[PDB]
Enzyme design. Sequence first.
Site, short mmCIF file in Angstrom:
data_model
loop_
_atom_site.label_atom_id
_atom_site.label_comp_id
_atom_site.label_asym_id
_atom_site.label_seq_id
_atom_site.Cartn_x
_atom_site.Cartn_y
_atom_site.Cartn_z
N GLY A 34 3.04 6.05 9.80
CA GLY A 34 4.32 6.09 9.17
C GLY A 34 5.12 4.78 9.38
N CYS B 166 4.12 1.28 9.04
CA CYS B 166 4.14 0.45 8.16
C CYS B 166 5.32 0.09 7.63
CB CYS B 166 3.04 0.91 7.01
SG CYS B 166 1.40 1.15 7.61
N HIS C 286 0.86 -1.26 0.00
CA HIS C 286 -0.02 0.03 0.10
C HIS C 286 0.70 1.42 0.03
CE1 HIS C 286 0.00 -0.23 4.51
NE2 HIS C 286 0.17 1.05 4.52
#
Lengths: 305, 305
Positions: free
Chosen positions: A143, A145, A41
């Site tokens: 932030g 991920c 993503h």
Amino acid sequence: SGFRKMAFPSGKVEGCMVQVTCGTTTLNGLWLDDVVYCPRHVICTSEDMLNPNYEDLLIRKSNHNFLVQAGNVQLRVIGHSMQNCVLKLKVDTANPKTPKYKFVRIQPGQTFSVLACYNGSPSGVYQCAMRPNFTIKGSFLNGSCGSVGFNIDYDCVSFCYMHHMELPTGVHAGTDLEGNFYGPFVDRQTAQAAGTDTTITVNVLAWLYAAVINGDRWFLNRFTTTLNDFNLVAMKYNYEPLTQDHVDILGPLSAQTGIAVLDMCASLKELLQNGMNGRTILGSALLEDEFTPFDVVRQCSGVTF
Amino acid sequence: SGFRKMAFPSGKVEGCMVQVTCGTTTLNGLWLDDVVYCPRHVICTSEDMLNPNYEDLLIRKSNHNFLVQAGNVQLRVIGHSMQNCVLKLKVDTANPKTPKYKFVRIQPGQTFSVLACYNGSPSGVYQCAMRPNFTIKGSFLNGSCGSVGFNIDYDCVSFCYMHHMELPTGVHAGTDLEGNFYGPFVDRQTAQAAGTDTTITVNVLAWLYAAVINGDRWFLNRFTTTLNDFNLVAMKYNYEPLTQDHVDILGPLSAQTGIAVLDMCASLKELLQNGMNGRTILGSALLEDEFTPFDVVRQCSGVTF
């Protein structure tokens, strides 16, 4: 003596963390040899996450659209592909700090260390367990991920988790390093809630053994129980069933303390039925279930890496 | 979201850990530039620890008597000296992995990360607080002496603790990196017990703010209190007095949540007097005092290094 929630030393993983930017989305990637792994993503805008078509989003991206930074140095992307829910970015430079490593898929109840990162820079390390409902109770802000979870065995880092999602209840979901989610979750902002969780019985028992080894013995009672009778009680308190495999895994702690596993089960039965009456065990006022039997052995025996 | 006990990333410290052997005693040292720092009791046998004359023990040691190993590589010792309770071994090779670093002496109530090591090899990382009685509640086995505690500010490692001793109650004592003990303790196996400890009030308040930020709000009551009235209650529960300096340190958390510091004090007063009634706060059934206000800000804002 003493007993602490303890993470693995994070240095070998720190040397693998990079920043990956695609458009206006920035998150963390894992740089091993000449491949950077990150959540797919990274190619989504905020509106895309509501119902993303990842194949269609990715076909519109060039290698040059991926900005990978290792500290202050850009790594040139020379290829890209999607595997399940992760992206793999081939770069033209192999990571000089690549450790010996493996990709593993862990089982519910097992623990691992998380190196929480932002913008490719490590911020903190902590320990957590894969819950029986396939969530983890982490500490993750926007932030984070692409932060990874791992275990270490002397020189070899076993990567088991990559962070992808926070569910509306505040717990966390992610994938193994082949990009397959733990649990039924998907990388889309949709109605997906964690199923009911359960307590990891074998881990509570391991921690009660750790307590005895450290001298916290007040909860030991004079009784024993059968495995079947213990499991009837455990069920009522939303504890997962104790299997003979679990009993076997606890053997070394039973040997060290002289307390048979079924005797410790009888003491846990009494704690479940009567509570702790305001006392503590290893500084905790509730029963702790995120130490595995192997974690207890490691910390009580001083295993190094 | 989520809130975890979180250590600093340990990689910069891992690259400084060496093994130091003198005779039959082996422990950990810290290798910075061309100096290895370690506890001076590396020169003691087990019988020496009962009443050691460190100057007399050291005059009988040559440089060659110190075996320093960085992984599988021996570092040649070319000088040695004692500073307070630490030894400084000059070696003929500067550590290529020396980070930017400082030596600091921390205050009671402040927290730091510990990299627990055995035989010069890192085993685990965890967070702990300098207690008001100048002990720490660590997790240390035989062979862990010389493990260090530290904080990191982006690129700079501030070393604040070196582990020396376990007291008969199972808590731990050590020095700063100039070799001066925290507290009244000495590196001799004698009758020295930790004085009565106290709870770190400003840290409990910080953690209650962390709870509110994470959505755990049930304990907020409708009252306020004066600072003097709060401190009369805190005293009875063995909490340290809250100073105006502490109130000022909590200002940013008060601003973020909209809860005045004295209003949070009124909610803590009620928790002390009435207990938690079997509920939890941030997954804990007791009040936690080993998160500083700065720790809460770091974890809730995502500071990296």
